[PDB]
Structure 1
Amino acid sequence: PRPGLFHLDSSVVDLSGDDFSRVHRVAPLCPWIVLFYNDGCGACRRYASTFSKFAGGLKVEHGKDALQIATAAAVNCASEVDLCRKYDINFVPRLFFFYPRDSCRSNEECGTSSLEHVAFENSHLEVDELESEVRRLVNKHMVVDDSLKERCIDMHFKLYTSKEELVKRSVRFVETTELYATDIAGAFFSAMHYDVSLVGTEPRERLTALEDFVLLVKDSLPSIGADGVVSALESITAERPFTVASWQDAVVKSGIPFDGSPRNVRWRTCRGSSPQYRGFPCGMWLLLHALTVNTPADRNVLEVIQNYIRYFFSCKECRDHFIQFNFSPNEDPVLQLWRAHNNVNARLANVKDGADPLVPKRQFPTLEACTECYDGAGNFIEAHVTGFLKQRYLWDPKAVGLMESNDDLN
């Protein structure tokens, strides 16, 4: 177990291998600048500083510049011997550029593509020459829609922040069961900042699906910052069309009361044993239940929800299964969504790969949590389950806004 030259540097991804889907599921879609080095190499030790300064510049939160879709990574040839032999690394340092043969386009479904690479002619580049050469290589080798840009920026911020945690803790787990308003807001924020940016507002069906959803969030959940979003949605004209850049600006400016920052969203209820687990998906369920519970009028909540998931949700498999749900008009939406979710819980009960080992899926609510709706001896009582859900998901606008503790800088 060698630390290498980057162990404290959250801007650089340490690679043990060639398969970028093990880094992250979106990684194969994005360009990589890779430093092969040896941790005992003085020249490499000296250059790692330059490489690290450069990587630090791949942290812009909303980039205009296509350089920003790149991410820096490194392979320590002292640890990964087979990998370096595979690339014929003899002398170090060496810079390689990696990129997908074909680029994913906005509303196409990105598939697996062939991993391509380009050895740099000169591996001694200064920071500025590094940016120029990486930008050039990205432009030459890739077609980047705004959606793909968002895809990759989001992906490397997940890694920066996950590694920074490991670094911070380099100086036991218990699930947080209580519902926190801020998770619902994080979900709303991530829905607007990420999911909508990927697909845009076209065609008219999709734009309608989004308008209904945002309109619903605003009227269901006051003081969650949906006002600004509504305004942004209204500002779109054939004259001033949707752009990811202006959309994300308005979204950030809406003042949604999520914890964390636009590129690092803090989950509480939805925090997992590792940051790759739970988070946004867990957040979305919460937002959806809260809407069923807090919805005004005869409002079509289940219909609105399903239209949104259909045109918006960034989980392919999730989107496909949720559309298969036939929601009856009769039964209470709170109960229908509740059954749907537990249905998904059941399917997912035993999955190993991809799952948080320390957060089982159960049938919800559990005995402990609710003994009043969970009674009837050996079965489930759907009488109190409503009361429990309408209690637990009830939205109190003064819950979110209120002093938070600064020591949560930790």
Structure 2
Amino acid sequence: ADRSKIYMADLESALHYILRIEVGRFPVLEGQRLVALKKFVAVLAKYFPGRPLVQNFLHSVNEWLKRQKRNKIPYSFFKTALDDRKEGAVLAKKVNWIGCQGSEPHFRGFPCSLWVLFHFLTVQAARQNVDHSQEAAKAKEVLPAIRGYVHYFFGCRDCASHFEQMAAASMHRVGSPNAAVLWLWSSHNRVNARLAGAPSEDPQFPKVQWPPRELCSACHNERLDVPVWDVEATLNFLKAHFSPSNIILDF
């Protein structure tokens, strides 16, 4: 795969994995886990960079949730809605990792696709006009939606505990779409720092403070008495990297 390229197969297997495996770990979707589910889905429908069918599917599922008056939705009930709207023909029946494929089955995979997805949502919401309060409010729900999803659905708790630590510590300081793009970007790099050279690291895919120079030379400053990262150059790299034009459609 290409490190500068994003594969639609990764983003789609992410949606398929989230809907079938992650939400399905809970027999009854209720309370706050349900609220977070609804918020995240609404974010997907609006910002996921999906093709025609995908976006139609997301909107339909999103409309189904909104209509559910029950304050408790058994997964059984939710599974039907996915089936009725045929998430199968829309996404796929099996996960398909490309840029997120690990040197071994237990490496990378979903977690990798979920970060990519989270970053894309942030960028998408920062690459859409938000000068209108109505949508400037929808853009504001991205990071919290992402926080809610991680807490209530993300598989490895080991993983959710470390994100939430960063979240509680400084997410309350993000005051704009680009600010959110950067927060998620640097929070992921903090995680990269913690996991670097760890025994669980994918040998073939060592952690680095991303993006590396080989990927974006203009992103790093040169002087040592100034920030390590040229935030402006980096932000521009992000919007370009996490954009529809950089997505390699799975034809």
Specify if TM > 0.5.
yes
1:329 aligns with 2:142: no
The answer on whether the counterparts of 1:349 and 1:360 sit within 8 Å (CA) in structure 2 is: yes
C-alpha separation in 2, matches of 1:176 and 1:275: 19
| SS of residue paired to 2:208 | coil
The residue that corresponds to 2:22 in the other structure is: 195
After TM superposition, give the deviation of residue 188 of structure 1 in Å.
1.6
Matched with 1:227 is: 59
Structure with the higher helix share, 1 or 2 = 2
Distance across 2 between alignment mates of 1:358 and 1:397: 24
In 2: Cα distance, 1:314 partner to 1:330 partner: 29
Given candidates 293, 297, 302, the residue that maps to 2:136 is 297
Tell me how far 1:396 sits from its aligned partner.
5.6
Offset of 1:184 from its aligned partner? 1.4
Where do 5+ consecutive residues of structure 1 fail to align?
Answer: 1-174, 405-410
Matched, 1:247 2:78: yes
Q: Which SS does the other structure have where 1:266 is aligned?
A: coil
Report the AA paired with residue 369 of structure 1. Answer: L
1:243-280 alpha-carbon deviations (Å, 9 max, x no partner)? 4344234335136854xx42x31111101112221110
Q: Does 1:269 align with 2:116?
A: no
One-letter amino acid matched to 2:234: V
Match of 1:283 in 2: 113
Q: Using the aligned pairs only, state the percent identity.
A: 31
What SS does the corresponding residue of 1:360 show, helix, strand or coil?
coil
Deviation at 1:305, TM superposition (A): 0.9
Partner letter of residue 304 of structure 1?
A
Q: Could you give the per-residue CA deviations for residues 148-187 of structure 1, whole angstroms, max 9, x where no partner exists?
A: xxxxxxxxxxxxxxxxxxxxxxxxxxx6412112211211
Distance 1:370 1:377, change over 3 A: farther
Return closer, same or farther for 1:248/1:334 CA change in 2, 3 Å cut-off.
same
For each residue in 1:300-343, what CA deviation from the matched residue of structure 2 results, as whole angstroms up to 9, or x when unmatched? Answer: 21111101111111111111111112311336100000000000
Query: Kindly tell me: are residues 351 and 200 of structure 1, through their superposed partners in 2, closer, same or farther at Cα, counting changes over 3 Å?
Result: same
What are the residue-to-residue correspondences of 1:289-368 with 2, within 5 Å? 289-295=119-125, 297-298=136-137, 299=139, 300-324=141-165, 325=167, 326-327=170-171, 328-330=173-175, 332-352=179-199, 354-368=200-214
Secondary structure in 2 aligned to 1:219? helix
Root-mean-square deviation (CA, aligned residues, Å) is 2.6
- Provide Cα deviations, 1:25-61, integer angstroms capped at 9, x if missing partner: xxxxxxxxxxxxxxxxxxxxxxxxxxxxxxxxxxxxx
Are the structure 2 counterparts of residues 244 and 310 from structure 1 closer, same or farther at C-alpha, using a change threshold of 3 Å? same
Quickly say closer, same or farther: Cα 1:367–1:192, change in 2 above 3 A.
Answer: same
Residues 255, 384 of structure 1: alpha-carbon distance in 2 compared, 3 angstrom cutoff:
farther
Q: 1:189 to 1:230 in 2, by over 3 A?
A: same
Per the TM alignment, residue 202 of structure 1 is displaced from its structure 2 partner at its CA by 3.7
Higher relative contact order structure (alpha carbons within 8 Å, sequence separation ≥ 6): 2
Counterpart secondary structure, 1:273: coil
What is the Cα deviation at residue 377 of structure 1?
Answer: 4.8
Q: Which amino acid counterpart does residue 82 of structure 2 have in structure 1? A: V
Which has the greater radius of gyration? 1
Rounded Cα–Cα distance in structure 2 between residues aligned with 1:280 and 1:203: 25
**What is the CA deviation profile of residues 281-301 of structure 1, one whole-angstrom value per residue up to 9, with x for unaligned ones?**
001001100110112533221
Q: How many pairs are equivalent?
A: 223
Is the CA contact 2:102–2:202 (under 8 Å) kept in the aligned structure 1? yes
- The residue that corresponds to 2:231 in the other structure is 382
Q: What are the superposed Cα offsets for residues 106-129 of structure 1, whole Å, 9 maximum, x if unpaired? A: xxxxxxxxxxxxxxxxxxxxxxxx
* Structure 2: gaps (5+ residues): 126-134
- State how far apart, in whole Å, the 1-side matches of 2:81 and 2:223 are: 52
CA distance in 1, matches of 2:107, 2:11: 17
How far, CA to CA, are the matches of 2:158 and 2:107 in structure 1? 16
TM-score norm. by structure 2 comes to: 0.79
Q: Following the alignment from structure 1 to structure 2, what is the Cα–Cα distance between the partners of residues 382 and 201? A: 43
Instruction: Tell me, yes or no, if the aligned pair for 2:221 and 2:230 is still in contact at 8 Å.
Output: yes
Contact conserved, 1:218 with 1:226, CA < 8 A, in 2?
A: yes
Aligned partner (choices 38, 41, 45) of residue 214 of structure 1: 41
Look up the SS of the partner of 2:201 in the other structure.
Answer: coil
* C-alpha distance in structure 2 between counterparts of 1:367 and 1:195, whole Å: 35
Q: Secondary structure at the match of 1:217?
A: helix
Return 214-223 or 373-382, whichever deviates more: 373-382
User: CA separation of 1:397/1:389 partners in 2, compared to 1, >3 Å: closer, same or farther?
Assistant: closer
Amino acid at match of 2:218: E
Alignment equivalent of 1:395, drawn from 231, 244, 250: 244
CA shift in 2, pair 1:315/1:382, >3 Å: same
